Each structure stands twice: as C-alpha cells, then as structure tokens.
C-alpha cells in the first residue's frame, strides 16, 4: 500500500520474473522454490498460482502479486517468517550465514553476484566483525 512498499515488492517480483515478461509462471515459481530446497510437483505449483491468479490466465501479474503481498503482511507471523528465512540461508545449520552460503543462495535464485557484491552484502550485515552473519544481524538487516 505505501509507495515504498510497492517499490520493494516490485524488486521482489523481478526476482521471480526472470524473463521480464511481467508475469510469473509455474516454471518461474518452481525454479525459485527448488532453489530454496523445496520439491514441489507441477500440480502443487499450479495450485499455488491458482490461489493468487485473480483473472484465471494461469500466471501471476504484478497487480496480483501486490494483492498477495498485502495479504501476507496482514496475516503472516512476521517473527516466524524471519526465522524460516534465516534457516534457508544457513545451509549447514550452524547459526551463521557465511559468504559462501549467501553466494550459493543468491546463485540458486539466479542472481550471479560478483565477488564485490557478495563482500558488500556480508560487510554491511556483519555488525560484530566476525565475517559472517548471525541471527541478530540478519534480523537487524531485514527490519531496520
């Protein structure tokens, strides 16, 4: 609903819409889900899209995505959402996101970050200077 939120969500939409055709398909959603360790079936992917597909055209457009994000903001448990997100990044489950783990996640998400880009993400999140990102640092990065 705010213009700042719309801009953030537009950037989020772009990650799913890899071909920039303005729609998210089952292929695109599946690609992202699998990159996050999930193993959905095509039937599941179609059902996921169907839920947010207001016009029944089989894909998600930005307006539909916005409606979905507004719904998420109001119904979802924000604290649990951040904990589950941290666990996605922390592949080995040791409590810290390493630069390698971050790069692996981003690469899976189709973002082929440069060495400099990865270093910047870690440096900015790494408040305590140990070279990795702990949970508190992650929370601070996402909420402030």
């Amino acid at each position: 609903l705010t213009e700042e939120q719309i801009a953030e969500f537009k950037e989020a939409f772009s990650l799913f819409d890899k071909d920039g055709d303005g729609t998210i398909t089952t292929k695109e959603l599946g690609t992202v889900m699998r990159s996050l360790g999930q193993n959905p079936t095509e039937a599941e992917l179609q059902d996921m899209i169907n839920e947010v597909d207001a016009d029944g055209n089989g894909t998600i457009d930005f307006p539909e995505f916005l409606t979905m994000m507004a719904r998420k903001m109001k119904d979802t448990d924000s604290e649990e959402e951040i904990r589950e997100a941290f666990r996605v990044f922390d592949k080995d489950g040791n409590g810290f996101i390493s630069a390698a783990e971050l790069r692996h996640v981003m690469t899976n998400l189709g973002e082929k970050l440069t060495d400099e880009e990865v270093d910047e993400m870690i440096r900015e999140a790494d408040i305590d200077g140990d070279g990795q990102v702990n949970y508190e640092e992650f929370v601070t990065m996402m909420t402030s």
Binding site: E11, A12, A85, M142
Partner: peptide, 25 residues
Amino acid sequence: IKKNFAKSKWKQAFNATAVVRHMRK
C-alpha cells in the same frame, strides 16, 4: 558498490523466501 546496495539486495532475497513460504500455505 553504492552504500544502499546491501540492504536492498538482502531484502529482495528475503522476500523471495517469504513469498514462497506464504504461497505454499
């Protein structure tokens, strides 16, 4: 790299997880 890159890129990745989490149930 501009100073604002990190916050925005972290949030984009976070949102990808949040969207999948929300849409799957």
